[PDB]
Coordinates of C-alpha atoms in Angstrom, one line a residue:
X1 CA 0.0 0.0 0.0
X2 CA 1.8 3.0 1.3
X3 CA 4.1 2.8 4.3
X4 CA 4.1 6.5 5.2
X5 CA 6.1 7.0 8.4
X6 CA 9.1 8.6 9.9
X7 CA 12.4 6.8 10.4
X8 CA 14.2 8.0 13.5
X9 CA 16.8 9.9 11.5
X10 CA 19.8 9.5 13.7
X11 CA 21.7 7.1 11.6
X12 CA 22.7 3.7 12.8
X13 CA 19.4 3.0 14.5
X14 CA 17.2 0.2 13.2
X15 CA 13.9 1.5 11.8
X16 CA 11.3 -1.2 11.8
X17 CA 8.1 -1.1 9.7
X18 CA 5.5 -3.8 10.3
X19 CA 3.2 -2.8 7.5
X20 CA 0.6 -5.4 6.5
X21 CA -2.0 -5.3 3.8
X22 CA -4.8 -7.8 2.9
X23 CA -3.8 -10.8 0.9
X24 CA -0.1 -10.7 1.9
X25 CA 1.8 -11.8 4.9
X26 CA 2.9 -9.2 7.5
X27 CA 5.3 -6.9 5.6
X28 CA 8.6 -5.9 7.3
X29 CA 10.8 -3.0 6.3
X30 CA 14.1 -2.3 8.1
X31 CA 15.8 1.0 7.5
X32 CA 19.1 2.5 8.6
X33 CA 20.3 6.0 7.6
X34 CA 23.7 7.3 6.7
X35 CA 24.9 10.8 5.5
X36 CA 21.9 13.0 4.6
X37 CA 23.8 16.2 4.9
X38 CA 22.7 19.8 4.3
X39 CA 25.0 21.3 1.6
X40 CA 24.0 25.0 1.6
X41 CA 24.5 26.7 -1.7
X42 CA 27.3 29.2 -1.2
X43 CA 28.1 32.6 -2.9
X44 CA 31.8 33.3 -2.5
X45 CA 32.8 36.9 -2.2
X46 CA 36.4 36.9 -0.9
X47 CA 39.9 35.9 -1.9
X48 CA 41.8 35.2 1.4
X49 CA 45.2 35.9 -0.1
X50 CA 48.4 37.6 1.1
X51 CA 49.3 41.2 0.2
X52 CA 52.2 42.1 -2.0
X53 CA 53.9 45.5 -2.4
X54 CA 55.2 46.1 -5.9
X55 CA 58.1 48.4 -4.8
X56 CA 60.0 49.1 -7.9
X57 CA 63.3 50.8 -8.4
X58 CA 62.8 54.4 -7.2
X59 CA 63.3 57.0 -10.0
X60 CA 66.2 59.1 -8.9
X61 CA 66.2 62.6 -10.2
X62 CA 69.7 63.9 -9.5
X63 CA 69.1 66.8 -9.5
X64 CA 65.5 67.3 -10.5
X65 CA 62.0 66.5 -9.5
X66 CA 61.1 63.3 -11.3
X67 CA 57.4 63.2 -12.1
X68 CA 55.2 60.5 -10.7
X69 CA 52.3 59.6 -12.9
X70 CA 49.6 57.1 -11.7
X71 CA 50.4 53.4 -12.1
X72 CA 47.9 50.6 -12.5
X73 CA 48.6 49.0 -9.1
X74 CA 45.8 48.5 -6.5
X75 CA 47.7 50.6 -4.0
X76 CA 49.8 52.6 -6.4
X77 CA 51.4 55.1 -4.1
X78 CA 54.3 57.1 -5.5
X79 CA 55.8 59.9 -3.6
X80 CA 58.5 62.3 -4.9
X81 CA 60.7 62.2 -1.9
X82 CA 62.9 65.1 -2.9
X83 CA 66.1 66.0 -1.2
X84 CA 67.6 62.5 -1.5
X85 CA 71.3 62.3 -0.9
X86 CA 72.2 59.1 -2.7
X87 CA 75.5 57.7 -1.4
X88 CA 75.7 54.1 -2.6
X89 CA 78.4 51.6 -3.4
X90 CA 78.9 51.6 -7.2
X91 CA 78.5 54.9 -9.1
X92 CA 77.1 58.4 -8.5
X93 CA 73.3 58.6 -8.3
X94 CA 73.9 62.2 -7.0
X95 CA 76.6 64.6 -8.2
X96 CA 75.1 67.8 -7.0
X97 CA 74.1 69.4 -3.7
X98 CA 70.2 69.6 -3.7
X99 CA 67.2 68.8 -5.9
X100 CA 68.2 65.1 -6.2
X101 CA 65.4 62.9 -5.0
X102 CA 63.7 59.5 -5.3
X103 CA 60.2 59.1 -6.7
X104 CA 59.1 55.9 -5.0
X105 CA 56.2 53.9 -6.2
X106 CA 54.6 50.7 -4.8
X107 CA 51.4 48.9 -5.7
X108 CA 49.2 46.6 -3.8
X109 CA 49.0 43.2 -5.6
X110 CA 47.7 39.8 -4.9
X111 CA 49.6 36.8 -3.5
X112 CA 50.9 34.0 -5.7
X113 CA 49.7 31.5 -3.1
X114 CA 46.0 32.2 -4.0
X115 CA 46.3 29.4 -6.5
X116 CA 48.0 27.6 -3.6
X117 CA 45.2 28.4 -1.1
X118 CA 42.2 30.8 -1.1
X119 CA 39.9 31.9 1.6
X120 CA 36.2 31.7 0.8
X121 CA 33.5 33.8 2.2
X122 CA 30.4 32.1 0.9
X123 CA 27.0 33.6 1.7
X124 CA 24.9 30.5 2.2
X125 CA 21.6 29.7 0.5
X126 CA 19.3 26.8 1.5
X127 CA 20.6 23.2 1.7
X128 CA 18.9 19.8 1.4
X129 CA 19.4 16.4 2.9
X130 CA 20.8 13.5 0.8
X131 CA 20.8 10.1 2.4
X132 CA 21.7 6.4 2.0
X133 CA 19.2 4.4 3.9
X134 CA 19.9 0.7 3.9
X135 CA 16.5 -0.7 3.4
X136 CA 15.6 -4.4 3.9
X137 CA 12.3 -4.8 2.2
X138 CA 11.6 -8.4 2.9
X139 CA 14.3 -10.4 1.1
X140 CA 15.3 -7.2 -0.7
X141 CA 18.4 -5.5 0.7
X142 CA 19.6 -2.3 -0.9
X143 CA 21.0 1.0 0.3
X144 CA 19.2 3.9 -1.4
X145 CA 21.3 7.0 -1.7
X146 CA 19.1 9.9 -3.0
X147 CA 18.3 13.5 -2.4
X148 CA 16.3 13.3 0.7
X149 CA 14.5 16.6 0.6
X150 CA 11.2 14.9 -0.5
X151 CA 11.3 15.9 -4.2
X152 CA 13.5 13.0 -5.4
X153 CA 11.3 9.9 -5.9
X154 CA 13.9 7.3 -4.9
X155 CA 13.4 4.2 -7.1
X156 CA 13.7 1.2 -4.8
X157 CA 13.8 -2.3 -6.0
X158 CA 10.0 -2.4 -6.6
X159 CA 9.6 0.5 -4.1
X160 CA 9.4 4.2 -4.1
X161 CA 11.2 5.9 -1.2
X162 CA 10.3 9.4 -0.5
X163 CA 12.6 10.5 2.3
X164 CA 11.7 14.1 3.1
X165 CA 10.5 17.0 3.0
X166 CA 12.3 17.2 6.3
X167 CA 11.9 20.2 8.6
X168 CA 15.5 20.7 9.4
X169 CA 16.7 24.2 10.2
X170 CA 19.3 22.8 12.5
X171 CA 22.2 23.0 10.0
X172 CA 25.7 24.3 10.0
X173 CA 24.5 27.2 7.9
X174 CA 25.5 30.6 9.2
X175 CA 24.9 33.9 7.4
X176 CA 28.4 33.8 5.9
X177 CA 30.8 30.8 6.0
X178 CA 34.6 31.3 5.7
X179 CA 36.1 28.1 4.3
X180 CA 39.9 28.0 4.6
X181 CA 41.8 24.8 3.7
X182 CA 38.9 22.7 4.9
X183 CA 38.6 24.7 8.0
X184 CA 35.0 25.9 8.4
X185 CA 34.0 29.1 10.2
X186 CA 30.6 30.6 10.6
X187 CA 32.4 34.0 10.7
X188 CA 31.2 37.5 9.8
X189 CA 32.5 38.3 6.4
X190 CA 32.7 42.1 5.7
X191 CA 31.3 44.0 2.9
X192 CA 32.8 43.2 -0.5
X193 CA 35.7 45.7 -0.4
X194 CA 35.2 47.6 2.8
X195 CA 37.8 46.1 5.2
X196 CA 39.6 47.7 8.1
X197 CA 43.4 47.7 7.6
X198 CA 44.5 44.5 9.2
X199 CA 40.8 43.4 9.3
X200 CA 40.2 39.7 8.8
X201 CA 39.9 39.4 5.1
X202 CA 41.6 42.6 3.7
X203 CA 42.1 41.5 0.1
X204 CA 39.1 42.2 -2.2
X205 CA 38.5 38.8 -4.0
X206 CA 35.6 39.3 -6.3
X207 CA 36.7 36.5 -8.5
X208 CA 39.1 33.6 -7.8
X209 CA 40.9 34.7 -11.0
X210 CA 39.5 38.2 -10.5
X211 CA 40.7 41.6 -11.8
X212 CA 40.6 44.0 -8.9
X213 CA 41.5 44.0 -5.2
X214 CA 39.9 46.2 -2.5
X215 CA 42.4 46.7 0.3
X216 CA 42.6 49.0 3.3
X217 CA 45.9 47.5 4.2
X218 CA 47.7 50.5 2.8
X219 CA 51.4 51.1 2.4
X220 CA 52.9 54.3 3.8
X221 CA 55.8 55.8 2.0
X222 CA 58.2 58.5 3.3
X223 CA 61.1 60.6 2.5
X224 CA 63.5 57.6 3.1
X225 CA 66.8 57.2 4.9
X226 CA 69.6 59.0 3.1
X227 CA 72.3 57.2 1.2
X228 CA 71.0 53.6 1.4
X229 CA 68.2 53.1 -1.1
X230 CA 65.3 52.5 1.4
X231 CA 61.9 53.5 0.1
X232 CA 60.2 52.2 3.3
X233 CA 56.5 51.5 3.1
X234 CA 54.4 51.3 6.2
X235 CA 52.0 48.6 5.1
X236 CA 49.2 47.0 7.0
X237 CA 49.6 43.9 9.1
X238 CA 48.4 40.9 7.2
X239 CA 44.8 40.1 8.1
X240 CA 45.1 36.9 6.1
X241 CA 48.1 36.3 8.3
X242 CA 45.8 36.8 11.3
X243 CA 42.4 35.5 10.2
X244 CA 44.0 32.1 9.4
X245 CA 47.2 32.2 11.5
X246 CA 45.8 32.8 14.9
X247 CA 42.3 32.2 13.5
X248 CA 39.6 31.1 16.0
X249 CA 38.2 27.8 16.9
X250 CA 37.1 26.5 13.5
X251 CA 33.4 26.0 12.7
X252 CA 34.3 22.4 11.5
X253 CA 34.6 21.8 15.2
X254 CA 31.7 22.6 17.5
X255 CA 29.0 20.9 15.5
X256 CA 25.6 22.1 16.9
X257 CA 23.1 19.2 16.7
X258 CA 26.1 16.8 16.8
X259 CA 26.8 16.8 13.1
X260 CA 29.9 15.9 11.1
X261 CA 30.8 18.8 8.8
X262 CA 33.0 18.3 5.7
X263 CA 33.6 20.5 2.7
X264 CA 34.5 19.2 -0.6
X265 CA 31.2 20.8 -0.9
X266 CA 30.3 22.2 2.5
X267 CA 27.8 19.6 3.9
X268 CA 27.2 18.0 7.2
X269 CA 27.3 14.2 7.0
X270 CA 26.0 12.1 9.8
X271 CA 24.0 15.0 11.2
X272 CA 22.0 13.5 14.1
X273 CA 19.0 15.7 13.9
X274 CA 15.3 14.9 13.6
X275 CA 13.4 12.1 12.0
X276 CA 13.4 11.4 8.3
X277 CA 9.9 11.6 6.9
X278 CA 9.6 8.7 4.5
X279 CA 6.8 7.6 2.2
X280 CA 7.2 4.1 0.9
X281 CA 5.2 3.6 -2.2
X282 CA 5.5 -0.2 -2.0
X283 CA 2.6 -2.5 -2.9
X284 CA 1.6 -5.9 -1.6
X285 CA 2.7 -7.3 -5.0
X286 CA 6.3 -7.5 -3.8
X287 CA 5.6 -9.2 -0.4
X288 CA 4.7 -12.8 0.3
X289 CA 1.0 -13.6 -0.2
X290 CA -1.2 -14.7 2.7
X291 CA -2.3 -17.9 1.0
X292 CA 1.1 -19.5 1.2
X293 CA 2.3 -18.3 4.7
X294 CA 2.7 -20.5 7.8
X295 CA -0.4 -20.1 9.9
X296 CA 1.0 -19.4 13.3
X297 CA -1.0 -20.2 16.4
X298 CA -0.5 -20.5 20.1
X299 CA 1.6 -17.3 20.4
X300 CA 3.2 -17.2 23.9
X301 CA 6.3 -15.0 24.5
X302 CA 8.8 -15.4 27.3
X303 CA 10.9 -13.0 29.3
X304 CA 14.4 -14.6 29.5
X305 CA 16.3 -11.6 30.7
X306 CA 15.9 -7.8 30.8
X307 CA 18.7 -5.3 30.1
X308 CA 18.0 -1.8 31.1
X309 CA 19.8 -0.1 28.2
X310 CA 21.6 -2.8 26.2
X311 CA 21.2 -3.2 22.4
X312 CA 19.7 -6.7 22.6
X313 CA 18.0 -6.0 25.9
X314 CA 15.6 -8.9 26.3
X315 CA 15.5 -12.6 26.0
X316 CA 12.2 -13.2 24.3
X317 CA 11.3 -16.8 23.8
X318 CA 8.2 -16.8 21.7
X319 CA 6.4 -20.1 21.5
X320 CA 4.2 -20.6 18.5
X321 CA 2.7 -23.6 16.6
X322 CA 2.8 -22.9 12.8
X323 CA 0.5 -24.3 10.1
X324 CA 3.4 -24.3 7.6
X325 CA 6.9 -22.9 7.4
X326 CA 7.8 -19.4 6.4
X327 CA 9.4 -16.1 7.5
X328 CA 8.1 -14.6 10.6
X329 CA 7.4 -10.9 11.0
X330 CA 8.5 -9.2 14.2
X331 CA 6.6 -5.9 13.6
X332 CA 5.4 -5.4 17.1
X333 CA 3.0 -2.5 17.8
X334 CA 5.1 -0.9 20.7
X335 CA 7.0 2.3 20.7
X336 CA 8.6 1.2 23.9
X337 CA 10.0 -1.9 22.2
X338 CA 12.5 -2.5 19.4
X339 CA 12.5 -5.9 17.6
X340 CA 16.0 -7.4 17.3
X341 CA 15.2 -8.2 13.7
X342 CA 12.4 -9.0 11.3
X343 CA 13.5 -12.5 10.5
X344 CA 11.5 -15.0 12.4
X345 CA 12.2 -18.7 11.6
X346 CA 10.1 -21.8 11.5
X347 CA 8.1 -22.0 14.7
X348 CA 8.7 -23.4 18.1
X349 CA 10.4 -21.2 20.7
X350 CA 11.9 -18.4 18.7
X351 CA 14.4 -16.6 20.9
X352 CA 14.7 -12.9 20.1
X353 CA 16.7 -10.0 21.4
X354 CA 13.8 -7.9 22.7
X355 CA 15.4 -4.5 22.6
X356 CA 13.7 -2.0 24.8
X357 CA 15.0 1.1 26.6
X358 CA 12.0 1.3 28.9
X359 CA 12.6 -0.3 32.3
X360 CA 9.1 -1.7 32.7
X361 CA 8.9 -3.5 29.3
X362 CA 5.5 -4.6 28.0
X363 CA 5.9 -5.2 24.2
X364 CA 2.9 -6.1 22.1
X365 CA 4.8 -8.3 19.7
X366 CA 3.5 -9.1 16.3
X367 CA 4.5 -12.6 15.2
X368 CA 3.2 -14.2 12.0
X369 CA 0.0 -12.2 12.0
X370 CA -0.6 -13.0 15.6
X371 CA 0.4 -10.9 18.6
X372 CA 1.3 -11.2 22.3
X373 CA 2.3 -8.9 25.3
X374 CA 5.6 -9.7 26.9
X375 CA 6.3 -8.2 30.3
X376 CA 9.5 -7.8 32.4
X377 CA 11.8 -5.5 34.3
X378 CA 15.2 -4.4 32.8
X379 CA 18.6 -4.1 34.5
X380 CA 20.7 -1.2 35.6

């Protein structure tokens, strides 16, 4: 028919489904999730690169004011530091008393390690879960890995999974994510080209192969030291040297909701949040028919032992006399219980790990189209 339910979407947990239609046997589905991560769509506006000062050879005018036309550099500061007294090693840059000077020009330019490593300030759009649920649909065993936001009709082997539309706002989405070498950071990116000098992210990186560079990390020229050719430039301190080196606790750590973030694309695999809303369009024309199933009778379950919080939990010895052989459904109608499997063998005393986290267990077990109510007390 349509097994419309919610798997408990904290992956690793068994997810039973004792769905039974007329004409068939009891139908048993067993799901287990893995990796339905968010993947918010980024919009990168940043470079995260190191600054560079194109400080060329200063035009000596000896004597004479050398003109300083505007360069094409992103910080193209030239200053006609006049009154330069050039006394150097190997041949007279000054031969007069005054009017000799150095026009000094430097230009802000990008780093060459941007191709080595960038820094990405992506503004995040929405994201959507994508999951691999191992589904045991009777004798079918297959792990369906599809976009789990509800739109993608997951073609099962004779089934139609619809995992989603899940309500998850608990995500690693911030307003702006800085990604740096795999290091995540939900960190406040500035305006595109408005940084403070030495602010975190000083280089304007509109494109990763871009053409401009906003930068408030300005050089500061001066009338330099006499004799030695020192056109000193009081530049900014490197914010990319700071915002990575001596960067904060990275947003890859500190996963709220207990998720596992990872960024080839920035997505949070294993994110233990919520239940997966799943609609199984699966008919009774894949399951075993009711006319050929073993007619179980005399259903009496036992309480062999009770664990308080163990995985297996309970010793459940279910006595049952069967009309014929067959597979036995376990799909008990108890939220306080968890069936150890949906497997059940040819009849007799079927032992079963009656998993139950409740201390006062009373599980209404469904066995072969019959039911019982096992009772017990767990352990500490």
